[PDB]
Write a protein that binds this ligand. Sequence first.
Ligand code: HEM
Ligand code: TZF
Length: 394
Amino acid sequence: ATVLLEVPFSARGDRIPDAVAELRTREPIRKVRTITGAEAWLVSSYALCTQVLEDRRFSMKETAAAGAPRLNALTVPPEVVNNMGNIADAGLRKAVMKAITPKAPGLEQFLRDTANSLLDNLITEGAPADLRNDFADPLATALHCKVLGIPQEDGPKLFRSLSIAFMSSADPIPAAKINWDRDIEYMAGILENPNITTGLMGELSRLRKDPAYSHVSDELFATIGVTFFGAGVISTGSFLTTALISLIQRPQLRNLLHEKPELIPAGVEELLRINLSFADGLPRLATADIQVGDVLVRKGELVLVLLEGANFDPEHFPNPGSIELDRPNPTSHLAFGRGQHFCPGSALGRRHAQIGIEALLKKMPGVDLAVPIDQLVWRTRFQRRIPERLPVLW
Ligand code: HEM
Ligand SMILES: Oc1ccc(-n2cncn2)cc1
């Protein structure tokens, strides 16, 4: 006898497990058991992942209901799972989206100057360098302090919450409450701080005192600061780190992009497509009985949308393991999700990776791993796949 197939399959972010293609071909929706012991439907083809993500009867908000089958334990309060819905209901969606575009005057030059400073510091210190802790994550943190309008020197303490806040745990995490309550108190103080006049928190601070938003709660304003910092920093730092592995493992492409930097946006879109940064399928709870493939999903059941299942599906992306800069469908991957919950930071996340890669390739054209690839240590039981250190030489 064996037990039901367990997810996730592997915390490694540098290779896709052969099980994914076997599932996708033979059983593109099939039952699995999550780390909590709950059963779920794992969906692994492009067609069925898109069907679930575009049908709001597969609800994100409902995953937080008491008694639901769970992928993992909540690390935020249950109403915060509906964060974008609460931002939309408060009349703040357009304002939030406007503040986190990468097109803000000076923002790109700030990102390039920051990237070049971090790189020069590594060059001065000498190889080996850790491109996660001393490049990708400080670049993500500096970017998000600038986009929020908060002091750069407050970035490192806010960042140190994230190794707990983005855990994928079977059980509630006492330190995630301690750090969440402290980080909310910090954002509530930012909203009362007259020095904060720029970025997303300077905008929220003004709208909080405008009569049209006098009944939006202070808790929501503070929650937008904590969630957009945390989601943006973990997501951009982790994507850029694993994209740098994928580039270092393709010297032919590295060299192409160094020679023709105008191809960096196409290269980043393929690095998004092949990225294994999300450690778990995206969860949704069915609110109706819905046919998906050969399965009738029942109301109340959990569905998990496996992004690499869609993004490596050869029916959509032929030769899916290869980075090809001339595909006819290059932005149709699911790396930012799809539908109602498509990532609101997508443009910012693209620009952070394009600028970090352009800066790295000009400063360290010979960048290579300084350890054999199997020696990277992959974080476990986390919502992202990331190596704990990324040692390189150049
Ligand atoms: C390359 C970087 C990024 C990747 C790969 C990424 C990926 C994703 C994905 C896959 C979703 C959909 C989750 C779902 O449907 O269940 C999502 C949602 C989200 N992302 Fe991003 N993200 C990135 C950067 C950002 C940035 C820069 C921010 C903010 C500054 C951000 C904020 C959010 C938020 C707040 C949501 C929830 C949206 C909702 O619930 O409607 N992300 N992201
Ligand atoms: O809109 C958001 C929802 C959940 C999160 N987090 C999930 N784990 C940690 N934060 C961040 C933003």
